[PDB]
């Protein structure tokens, strides 16, 4: 529909549908449809608009989408500004959770290039 932002496809099982909203993995998904008392088996179009509304009515709780981005992105800025070790790593675009920087770690540092 127009849920929160726009995880709005169709002919996609409701759970898999809602996974596409940012900030929501399958866990939260089933937690939603179940809490909204729906059916993960359904295709969004077939789902009553009178239900989809209850889905927004559902997603209101879990922090999500843009708000989430703002929070976490703020958490990172919180760190680089903190001057903390990890903050320094983010500042260097290098692995955080202690890894082998001497070898792989290519994910963080960007694709092999230089």
């Amino acid at each position: 529909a127009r849920i929160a932002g726009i995880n709005i496809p169709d002919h996609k099982h409701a759970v898999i549908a809602l996974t596409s909203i940012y900030g929501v993995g399958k866990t939260r998904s089933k937690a939603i449809l179940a809490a909204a008392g729906i059916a993960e088996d359904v295709k969004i179009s077939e789902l009553s608009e009178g239900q989809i509304d209850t889905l927004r009515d559902e997603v209101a709780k879990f922090v999500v989408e843009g708000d989430l981005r703002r929070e976490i992105s703020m958490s990172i800025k919180r760190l680089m500004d903190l001057g903390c070790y990890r903050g320094l790593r983010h500042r260097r675009g290098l692995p955080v959770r202690g890894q082998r920087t001497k070898t792989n770690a290519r994910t963080r540092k960007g694709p092999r290039k230089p």
Binding site: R2, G5, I6
Partner: protein, 177 residues
């Protein structure tokens, strides 16, 4: 039309006691609302500008006036008298209707919306803002657009100060951080 009346009523009086205004003419008032999309992608695709026309038209309700370049610039790889964008200088009640059709729905529909700038003003109160995508307006199929072609709209004010202009916008509530 509707909130235009709202303007004619509350807004007018409210402001008369706001900026302790004298004559009714002393009140600033919306004038012309323009929509513009400097597509700039037409330089390679002439069939694309039309898509933009369909866009504004969808949001305006009236054929957008296309804009030709005013000067040639290699940095943007364009030449004189060359198409480059679509605009719509709608006014009167139409402008009003576009306004209600605007703030009441599309604005709240802004993805990741938090608030809206209170800063942006021309030095005369005339306001400016930039939408990020065409879908924010209902009428757009959303699914049928071949591309996100955000644009930006400007609202002319008969206001002189940037301040008095803002108060006019505050009359219609109209977001703002």
């Amino acid at each position: 039309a509707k909130l235009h009346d709202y303007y004619k009523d509350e807004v007018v009086k409210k402001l008369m006691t706001e900026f302790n205004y004298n004559s009714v003419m002393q009140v600033p008032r919306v004038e012309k609302i323009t929509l513009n999309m400097g597509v700039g992608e037409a330089i390679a695709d002439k069939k694309l500008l039309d898509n933009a026309a369909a866009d504004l038209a969808a949001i305006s309700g009236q054929k957008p006036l296309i804009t030709k370049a005013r000067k040639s610039v290699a940095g943007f790889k364009i030449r004189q008298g060359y198409p480059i964008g679509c605009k719509v200088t709608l006014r009167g009640e139409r402008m009003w209707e576009f306004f209600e059709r605007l703030i009441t729905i599309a604005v709240p529909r802004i993805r990741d919306f938090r608030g809206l700038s209170a800063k942006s003003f021309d030095g005369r109160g005339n306001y400016s803002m930039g939408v990020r995508e065409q879908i924010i307006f209902p009428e757009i199929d959303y699914d049928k657009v071949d591309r996100v072609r955000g644009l930006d709209i400007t609202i002319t004010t008969t206001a002189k100060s940037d301040e008095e202009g803002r108060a006019l916008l505050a009359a219609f509530d109209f977001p703002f951080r």
